Amino acid sequence: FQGVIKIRYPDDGQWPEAPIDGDGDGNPEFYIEINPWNIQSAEGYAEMTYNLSTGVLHYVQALDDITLKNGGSWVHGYPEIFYGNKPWNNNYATDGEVPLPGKVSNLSNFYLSVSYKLLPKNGLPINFAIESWLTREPWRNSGINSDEQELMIWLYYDGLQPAGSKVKEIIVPIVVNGTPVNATFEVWKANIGWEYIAFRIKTPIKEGTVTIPYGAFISAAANVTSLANYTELYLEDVEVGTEYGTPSTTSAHLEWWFYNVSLEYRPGEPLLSQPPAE
Instruction: Report how far residue 144's alpha carbon sits from residue 132's, in angstroms, rounded to the nearest whole number.
Output: 12
Partner from Cl ion, Ca ion, a second copy, none binding residue 103, C-beta < 5-8 Å depending on class: Cl ion
Establish if 27 lies at the interface with Ca ion (CB under 5 A): yes
Instruction: Report how far residue 22's alpha carbon sits from residue 29's, in angstroms, rounded to the nearest whole number.
Output: 8
- Which CB sits closer to a second copy, 137 or 207? 137
Q: According to CB under 8 A, which one of 90, 146, 177, 231 is a site residue for a second copy? A: 146
Residue 32 Cβ vs Cl ion, minimum distance, rounded to whole Å: 18
3-state SS, residue 218: helix
| Other residues' Cβ atoms within 10 Å of the Cβ of residue 200 | 23
Structural contact between residues 121 and 129, judged by C-beta atoms closer than 8 angstroms? no
Q: According to CB under 8 A, which one of 9, 30, 59, 74 is a site residue for a second copy? A: 74
Q: According to CB under 8 A, which one of 65, 139, 193, 232 is a site residue for a second copy? A: 193
Residue 189 Cβ vs Ca ion, minimum distance, rounded to whole Å: 36
Is 147 a known ligand-binding residue? no
Scanning 21-29, 32-40, 214-222, 254-262 for contacts with a second copy by CB under 8 A, the matching segment is 32-40
Is 27 a known ligand-binding residue? yes
| Other residues' Cβ atoms within 10 Å of the Cβ of residue 256 | 23
Structural contact between residues 67 and 36, judged by C-beta atoms closer than 8 angstroms? no
Instruction: Report how far residue 35's alpha carbon sits from residue 129's, in angstroms, rounded to the nearest whole number.
Output: 14
Query: Residues in the site for a second copy, rule: CB under 8 A?
Result: 37-38, 40-41, 67-74, 142-147, 189, 191-195, 226-229, 247
